[PDB]
Design a protein around this ligand. Structure first.
Ligand SMILES: *[C@@H]1O[C@H](CO)[C@@H](O[C@@H]2O[C@H](CO)[C@@H](O[C@@H]3O[C@H](CO)[C@@H](O)[C@H](O)[C@H]3NC(C)=O)[C@H](O)[C@H]2NC(C)=O)[C@H](O)[C@H]1NC(C)=O
Lengths: 288, 69
């Protein structure tokens, strides 16, 4: 009749090489850059402020994330058996942790600049622990359903309710994109709005750094989530889907998802590598 | 897991109901990565169709297919 199956084999076969390559890139620059972050901090300057704590934790989350990618590339080839649960766990936990600490940077510097609230290294470590735990509890619905069957990582959808993938997509959309972007945008907007009128001679670079942070975050995460939205719209039966549309949506999802992974490679260049502290001069200026 | 890692290539919207048991030339089991129990049927017309695995007639079709070729 019309129960004709919608085949996806060509899309997967075409997306495989690109995905492999990108994963390789991200593992390369990611591992290198972030381990470089940890080394640089730990030896050149033992944690002198909360920012250093958050930077190390960010680099650690990113390292944990990129170190899962080689396993995934090994997965893509020949479809070796390694636990799906644990790998997916590390994947999502590292991701959410990365986002969390990215938010925490903006928060820390926000309370530091405008409201003039200052946190010692101790408190920073405490909050870091908090963020890791919160990152695990928010990753739970993403890996606790994943199991190994027929040597393949699968989410048994028939044993779950139809609302689950939708709720998952929504939680991912607001939790990973909306609420971090909103916070960092607000914080950096306030900070920029204060430093632009500040006494500091060369306020400008500070603003440029923050702007760069926001912009990069957008141009790397927005395509993926924007695809997630219309995918959810398909699952929500709000829009109609053809076989071709489901195919195009699949390809878009895969590609953009791979795109979003480079952000963790960009993270070392956005906070730690950025250079001298133009913000510390402003910091001394504001103390009057 | 995520979308970049997926070995699922077949998605079924509906199911074929009853007939026939002779038109089939081959059948394929759905991928595990799909997470949806379904059977794929390739008939003599080289056309593919989705069939629910928990059907009384399916278990009888797979018999003739497995025994023949
Ligand atoms: C959906 O993707 C599949 C990915 O390979 C396509 O090809 C199928 O690949 C299977 C690999 O897992 C093959 O499995 C075979 O299974 C038999 C058991 O009956 C084993 O003895 C064989 O060793 C094994 N062969 C290989 C090479 O692993 C399937 O035979 C194969 N199926 C087909 C029809 O080619 C699917 O084709 C694809 N779906 C569609 C509709 O094209």
């Amino acid at each position: 009749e019309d129960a004709t199956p919608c085949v996806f084999t060509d899309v997967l076969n075409q997306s495989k090489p690109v995905t492999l390559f990108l994963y390789g890139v991200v593992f390369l620059f990611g591992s290198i850059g972030n381990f470089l972050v940890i080394f640089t901090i730990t030896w050149r300057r033992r944690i002198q402020c909360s920012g250093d704590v958050y930077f190390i934790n960010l680099a650690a989350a990113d390292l944990l994330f990129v170190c899962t990618l080689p396993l995934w590339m090994q997965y893509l080839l020949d479809h070796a058996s390694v636990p799906c649960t644990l790998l997916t766990a590390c994947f999502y936990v590292a991701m959410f942790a990365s986002l969390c600490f990215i938010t925490e940077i903006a928060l820390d510097r926000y309370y530091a600049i405008v409201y003039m609230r200052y946190r010692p290294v101790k408190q920073a470590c405490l909050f870091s622990i908090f963020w890791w735990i919160f990152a695990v509890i928010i990753a739970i619905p993403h890996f606790m359903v994943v199991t190994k069957k027929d040597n393949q990582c699968m989410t048994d959808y028939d044993y779950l309710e139809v609302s689950y993938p939708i709720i998952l997509n929504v939680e991912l959309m607001l939790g990973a994109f909306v609420i971090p972007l909103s916070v960092i945008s607000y914080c950096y907007y306030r900070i920029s709005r204060i430093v632009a009128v500040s006494q500091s001679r060369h306020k400008g670079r500070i603003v440029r750094v923050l702007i760069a942070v926001v912009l990069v975050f957008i141009i790397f995460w927005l395509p993926y989530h924007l695809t997630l939205f219309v995918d959810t719209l398909k699952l929500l039966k709000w829009i109609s889907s053809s076989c071709e549309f489901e195919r195009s949506l699949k390809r878009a999802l895969i590609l953009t998802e791979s795109l979003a992974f480079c952000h963790c490679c960009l993270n070392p260049l956005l906070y730690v590598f950025v250079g001298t502290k133009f913000r510390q001069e402003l910091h001394c200026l504001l103390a009057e | 897991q995520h979308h970049g890692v997926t070995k699922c290539n077949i998605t079924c919207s509906k199911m074929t109901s009853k007939i026939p048991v002779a038109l089939l030339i081959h059948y394929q089991q759905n991928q595990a990565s799909c997470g949806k129990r379904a059977i794929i049927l390739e008939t003599r017309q080289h056309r593919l169709f989705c069939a629910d695995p928990k059907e009384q007639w399916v278990k009888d079709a797979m018999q003739h297919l497995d025994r023949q070729a």
